[PDB]
Structures are given as structure tokens and as C-alpha cells.
């Protein structure tokens, strides 16, 4: 009389739908974080939705927290719905983190933060970033272990005017946690992957064998295998798979089986645009589905830069120069359309059509990379700082003004070979 993702829930660590390597590394990290030494303070779990990112922490705490606790068992999940009377919503998480640090000896309990505060609001987002930053840099000799399961999901289109970006596009850990936290030596980011087909089939078969009377009663036990295979091959979400299986089993008719559609990742979308999709051989259908399901990813200028930086992976880069010229020319034309959706459609349709007429069997492809634009902009900012310093020291010594363009082109190069080459002589 309830949903099948409950009741038929994992009871031990073996029942958890997770790969062996993932389980072993998560357990190693947890055991390292429960030692008296505090090499790692927080464990930043991340991954797609419903990838056993929550059901494994409780099972680990069932056989880890009591062992290392003192004598004189579960988690301390943060409730984001508790509206305290004399407490602002920003201060709710502050109080949570300031009261959860007292669980060290005789009160040890893992701190699980899955439902993050409204990080879409800038003020509380930076307050949370500061609070977790204080946790890493805390002078406290002993702190309890802490886990932040940031479920990555593609934030859909919104009516927010600007509100910067990042958290308005994706709900990844990089859009919530800042670079200082990610690169902190005491942070361990163990990412999670979608559940493999084998474990999904195993668990679905376990559910089916645990309830077969109604399956055979509704002449579905003989058709169970195809349904299980289709469900385990269409989605990598365990909870969604169980819900779909329950919906199909409880039903009585010929309703087609449907499941949630996964969002195509950035590298995945780049590969689909460059190489294609094995499922669909029609370019128009694939492009239309890609734009309809994920338009927040194909609209960013990074994806065009991604194609520009990754189209040299087809046949390791041995394709004709004319194809590359056409691709880059059309990319420039799309850049010259001020971000219209038509330009976004054309810049991918042309690439897919070009990489279709030259598709040759038995040609190894290379690897892709993120566009090298952040490095370039950081170097440009460094050069800006250098030019500003040079012009500042220039005006302080002598009354001569020099334009930044000339500094970049002429002054910048000759300034060392003049000043430092005469410092030698002094």
C-alpha cells in the first residue's frame, strides 16, 4: 500500500546498489575521516540524482559510528524546513553547523548535508561558503566528520534577470562550493556514477522475486524479463527504476513503460554533436531532442568553444582540412549572430553533417578537453596587472603617458630589455 522504493529498502551494506570500487573508496575515506587525526574533515560526495548517494551513508554509519563512539549510530541530517522563530533563514545553517561540532566523544554522529540551503540566493550562498570554509580552517582540535551530498542536476530555464550564473545553470558542487574549498587539502571529493545495468537488473530481479504472486496473477511474471531489461537499460536511477517497475506491475492494461530522461552532459553532448548517437541515425531527430531536453547547455558560449576545441578528435585529427575550415567558418558565423537560437541550431547541425559525410569505419578517435579560455583570461589579467604596475612606476618617475595598446605591443616587451639590461651595469 506504499511506494516500492520504500519498504523494499536496503537493510545492509551488500544490498546497497553501488559498485565495489566506489564502496571500497567511500569506506576508506570514511575510516580515514573517523581517526583521531583529521587529515580530511569533509567528504564532498557528488553525482547524478538517485545514484545511491544517500542510502550508503546510513548503512556505513550503521557499522562505523558505533565502533568509534565512546561509552560512559546514525546521521545528523540537516533539515532545511525548520523555520525557527527567532532565527533568520541564513542563521539556521549557521546554528546547525555551530551545534553539530559538539559531537566528538560519547556523542559522535556523522553530519550529512544533502538538502542544501537556498544557495540560489547569493547572500546565504556566500554565508554557507564562509561557514564551511571556517569548518576547514577551524582551530578546533577535534571536529566530527561531515558529508555534503550535492546532487548535481541541470537547473532549467528561469525568469531571473541576471543573478550572475553557475547556480542558475547547474546544481553542481563547483557552483555551490568555491575553489578554495575544492582545492583545500582537507577536502576529499568522491564523485558518484550512474548505477550500472548489472546491479539494476540484480535489484529489480530481487524485488520481483520478493513479490511474484501478483506478477503471475496479472500474467506479467513471464513478461518480467523484458520489462526489467528495458527499465535497467533506459535509466540509471535505482529509485526511478523501482517506481517505474511498481507502476507497471500494479497497472492492468497495455500502458507503455516510460521513465525519466537523463540530461546529456557537456562532454557527452560534445561527443554526440561530433560523433553522433548510436541509438538514432537521424541527425534532425537527435538535434531536436538534444535542444528540447537540454537547451541550458547548448546556449552557453562554452559549448561552441567546446566544439571548436574538440572537433580535432575525429580520426585523431586526420580528416580533410576543408571540413575543419567549414566547421570553423560556420562557428564564426554563429558567433556573428548574437546568440540567436537559430545560430545555436546551425552551429551543431553543420558540424554533425560535416562529420557524417566523412565518417570512416575503423578510425580511432582521440580525447577531448575543456576549452582553454580560463587559462587565457587569467594570463590576460596577469598581463593587465603587469601593465598597470609598469605604467604606475612609469608616471611616478617621469611625466610620460603611454597607452595600454602600446604597452601591450611595444613598451611591454622592450621595458625589461631596457631597464633590467641597464641594471646589470647600474
Amino acid at each position: 500500500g506504499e511506494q516500492w522504493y520504500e519498504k523494499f529498502k536496503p537493510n545492509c551494506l551488500e544490498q546497497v546498489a553501488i559498485h565495489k570500487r566506489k564502496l571500497k573508496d567511500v569506506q576508506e575515506a570514511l575510516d580515514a575521516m573517523f581517526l583521531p587525526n583529521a587529515k580530511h574533515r569533509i567528504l564532498l560526495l557528488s553525482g547524478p540524482s538517485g545514484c545511491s548517494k544517500s542510502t550508503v551513508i546510513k548503512e556505513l554509519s550503521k557499522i562505523l559510528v558505533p565502533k568509534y563512539r565512546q561509552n560512559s549510530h546514525k546521521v545528523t541530517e540537516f533539515r532545511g524546513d525548520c523555520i525557527v522563530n527567532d532565527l533568520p533563514q541564513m542563521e539556521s545553517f549557521s546554528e546547525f553547523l555551530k551545534g553539530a561540532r559538539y559531537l566528538v566523544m560519547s556523542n559522535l554522529s556523522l553530519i550529512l548535508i544533502e538538502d542544501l540551503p537556498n544557495v540560489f540566493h547569493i547572500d546565504t550562498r556566500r554565508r554557507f561558503q564562509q561557514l564551511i570554509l571556517q569548518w576547514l580552517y577551524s582551530s578546533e582540535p577535534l571536529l566530527p566528520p561531515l558529508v555534503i551530498c550535492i546532487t548535481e542536476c541541470e537547473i532549467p530555464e528561469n525568469d531571473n534577470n541576471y543573478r550572475k550564473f553557475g547556480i542558475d545553470y547547474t546544481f553542481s558542487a563547483e557552483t555551490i562550493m568555491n575553489k578554495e574549498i575544492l582545492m583545500h587539502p582537507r577536502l576529499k571529493r568522491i564523485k558518484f556514477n550512474p548505477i550500472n545495468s548489472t546491479l539494476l537488473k540484480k535489484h529489480l530481479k530481487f524485488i520481483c522475486v520478493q513479490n511474484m504472486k501478483m506478477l503471475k496473477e496479472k500474467n506479467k511474471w513471464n513478461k518480467r524479463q523484458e520489462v526489467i531489461d528495458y527499465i535497467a537499460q533506459e535509466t540509471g536511477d535505482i529509485r526511478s527504476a523501482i517506481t517505474t517497475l511498481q507502476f507497471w506491475a500494479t497497472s492492468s492494461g497495455s500502458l507503455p513503460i516510460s521513465t525519466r530522461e537523463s540530461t546529456i552532459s557537456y562532454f557527452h553532448a560534445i561527443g554526440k554533436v561530433i560523433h553522433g548517437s548510436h541509438s538514432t541515425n537521424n541527425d534532425n531527430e537527435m538535434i531536436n531532442n538534444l535542444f528540447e531536453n537540454s537547451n541550458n547547455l547548448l546556449s552557453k558560449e562554452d559549448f561552441k568553444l567546446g566544439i571548436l576545441e574538440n572537433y580535432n578528435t575525429f580520426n585523431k585529427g586526420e580528416f580533410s582540412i576543408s571540413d575543419a575550415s567549414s566547421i570553423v567558418d560556420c562557428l564564426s558565423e554563429c558567433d556573428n549572430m548574437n546568440g540567436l537560437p537559430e545560430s545555436n541550431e546551425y552551429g551543431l547541425r553543420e558540424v554533425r553533417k560535416t562529420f557524417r559525410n566523412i565518417s570512416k569505419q575503423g578510425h580511432n578517435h582521440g580525447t577531448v578537453y575543456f576549452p582553454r579560455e580560463w587559462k587565457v583570461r587569467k594570463l590576460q589579467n596577469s598581463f593587465k596587472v603587469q601593465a598597470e604596475d609598469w605604467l604606475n612606476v612609469s608616471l611616478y618617475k617621469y611625466n610620460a603617458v603611454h597607452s595600454f595598446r602600446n604597452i601591450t605591443l611595444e613598451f611591454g616587451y622592450y621595458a625589461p630589455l631596457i631597464r633590467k639590461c641597464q641594471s646589470y651595469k647600474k
Binding site: S49, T243, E342
Partner: protein
């Protein structure tokens, strides 16, 4: 001095039996009503195909007498933020309402595609703790708008466009219950202009009967207009340039359609076109994009549309 409900509201379905179209989905909803074990659902489809009416009918047939305090119909018109999800939805879900066996409260979050991200994140938490007593019933035109973590624990029932037979059946029921003189060609024209939208067909029939009386093709077409996505497809697929130019100048320009609308409809039709080569399709998309840029800059004129048609015909027929 009107006091007369529109035909859209007048013959609104109150049972899960007169809802035409999507026979399998309606049968599944009937099974849910019979049993009561309603799972979380996210109904998705084109506008005006019974998405909201089906949810309301299933809520009426599940809660029954407890419909007054068993359903919380929230919508885009009402305030839907993180605060409202954390207080009103939380209290409604947390409410201990006695219900018949196998019955759960139905939080009707209609137009859930327009909800804020933080509200959906709080919905995740409230649904994780309150799903043994309450069952959320989302209703949106696009399932992708609802975040995947929410879709993880919600069953998906995507609605399809109503066929020309179910719409005809419901229209005939309305005609019989209203005693309206009809013509076969008139009903065919109503179905054609409906484009699978039952509410639009009902509105067109009501307008035709109230303004002209007898419902035939002439009276339907003298008040309702042929869909412009079809004239756009006709002009884009015209082999000869003169034919397309005439189809534009007489059926989209003098008819009173803005150039920007003509460009957007052309882009959509090209996206959803068929029997055209991929290179031709992308070249047409590029031409439509150039024309769209020219329209947006402020050069919106018939000349730009004619140039777009000329470019399309040139890339279709070569040199």
C-alpha cells in the same frame, strides 16, 4: 447580465469516463481511482488536452467527500516560493487527515514548470518525509522543467495530442447536450483548426454557434482562421519562388501577421520539417537566423521576408 458559463467551463468533465483521448492513460487513472494507491505523477503534454481536468477528476474520485480538506491546488497565480513550500505545503502534508482505506492527500501543484528552483528543492525534502500520507500531482507542459531529483520518485505519465476521433466524440456529446445545428464539414473544420486542442475546439464551436448559428465550414472559417504554421509550411515548401512570395504577401502580410512571427514560425517549422535534406535544413535555418537578426535590429519589412524566401529557394534549387 450574462451569468452564463463558457462552454469550456460548462461541459467540463467531472468524471474520469468522459475525458476523451489517451485511452490507456485514462484507464490507468481509472484503475488508480478504483484501488486508491496513487503514486506521485508528473503529467506532461501540449496545452488543452485534459491534463488539469484529469487530475481534478481523479482527486474527486479518490478523496470523495474529503475533497474539501484533502487537496491543495497550488498554481502560478498563487504565490509559489520557498517560503510557501516550507509553510503551507509543509502544514498541508503534515496534517493528519483521516481518509478511507488506501487514500492519500493530493497536492495539486499545477503549472509546476513555473516554480522556482529553491521551491523544487524544498519539495524534494517535503516529499521525502511526507509521501505515506500525501501524493503530489504535478502538471506541466514540459517535464524537463521539473528537476530530475523530483522526477526520481515521481511516476511519469506523458499525455499525447488528442486524436481527431476523441475530439469529434466529445464535440458530438456537447452538440447533443446543447442541441446545436451542425454540419459534417463544419465539425471537420473545427477539428482541423483545433490542432489537437480540445479547449480551442470548444471555444471555436461556441463562437461559431453564438455568432452565426449553423456550424458549417463557411461559418467556421469566417470567424476562425486557418493555422499559420500551415501557411508557413506551405510557403517554405513551395518549389517556385513566385508561389511562395504570393502565399506570403496574401496570407501572412495582408492577413495581419508581424514579420517577427513569420520568422519564428518559419524557424519552428524548419526545425520540425520532413522530406528535406540535412544540408538544406541547416542552410534554411541559417537564412532564417540572418532574417531574424535583420528583423530584430529594426529593419522589419516585407522585403526582408522576400529576401529570406529567395535565399531558401536558391539553396533548394541551386544555381
Amino acid at each position: 447580465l450574462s451569468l452564463q458559463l463558457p462552454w469550456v467551463e460548462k461541459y467540463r468533465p467531472q468524471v474520469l469516463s468522459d475525458i476523451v483521448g489517451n485511452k490507456e492513460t485514462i484507464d490507468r487513472l481509472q484503475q488508480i481511482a478504483k484501488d486508491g494507491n496513487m503514486p506521485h505523477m508528473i503529467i506532461s503534454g501540449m496545452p488543452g488536452i485534459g491534463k488539469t481536468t484529469s487530475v481534478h477528476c481523479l482527486a474527486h474520485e479518490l478523496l470523495g467527500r474529503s475533497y474539501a480538506d484533502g487537496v491543495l491546488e497550488l498554481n502560478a497565480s498563487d504565490d509559489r516560493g520557498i517560503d510557501v513550500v516550507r509553510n503551507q505545503i509543509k502544514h498541508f502534508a503534515q496534517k493528519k487527515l483521516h481518509l478511507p482505506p488506501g487514500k492519500h492527500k493530493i497536492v495539486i501543484l499545477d503549472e509546476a514548470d513555473s516554480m522556482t528552483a529553491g521551491a523544487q528543492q524544498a519539495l524534494r525534502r517535503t516529499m521525502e518525509l511526507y509521501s505515506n500520507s500525501t501524493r503530489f500531482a504535478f502538471a506541466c507542459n514540459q517535464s524537463n522543467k521539473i528537476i530530475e531529483p523530483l522526477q526520481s520518485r515521481c511516476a511519469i505519465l506523458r499525455y499525447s495530442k488528442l486524436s481527431d476521433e476523441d475530439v469529434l466524440k466529445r464535440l458530438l456529446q456537447i452538440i447533443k447536450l446543447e442541441d446545436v445545428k451542425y454540419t459534417n464539414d463544419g465539425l471537420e473544420a473545427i477539428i482541423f483548426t483545433a490542432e489537437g486542442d480540445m479547449r480551442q475546439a470548444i471555444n471555436n464551436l461556441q463562437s461559431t454557434v453564438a455568432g452565426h448559428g449553423l456550424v458549417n465550414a463557411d461559418n467556421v472559417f469566417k470567424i476562425v482562421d486557418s493555422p499559420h504554421p500551415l501557411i508557413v509550411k506551405k510557403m517554405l515548401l513551395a518549389s517556385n519562388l513566385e508561389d511562395s512570395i504570393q502565399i506570403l504577401r496574401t496570407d501572412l502580410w495582408k492577413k495581419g501577421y508581424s514579420s517577427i512571427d513569420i520568422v519564428t514560425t518559419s524557424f519552428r517549422v524548419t526545425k520540425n520539417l520532413a522530406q528535406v535534406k540535412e544540408s538544406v535544413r541547416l542552410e534554411m535555418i541559417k537564412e532564417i537566423g540572418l532574417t531574424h537578426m535583420r528583423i530584430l535590429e529594426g529593419v522589419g519589412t516585407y522585403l526582408q521576408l522576400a529576401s529570406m524566401l529567395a535565399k531558401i529557394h536558391k539553396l533548394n534549387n541551386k544555381a
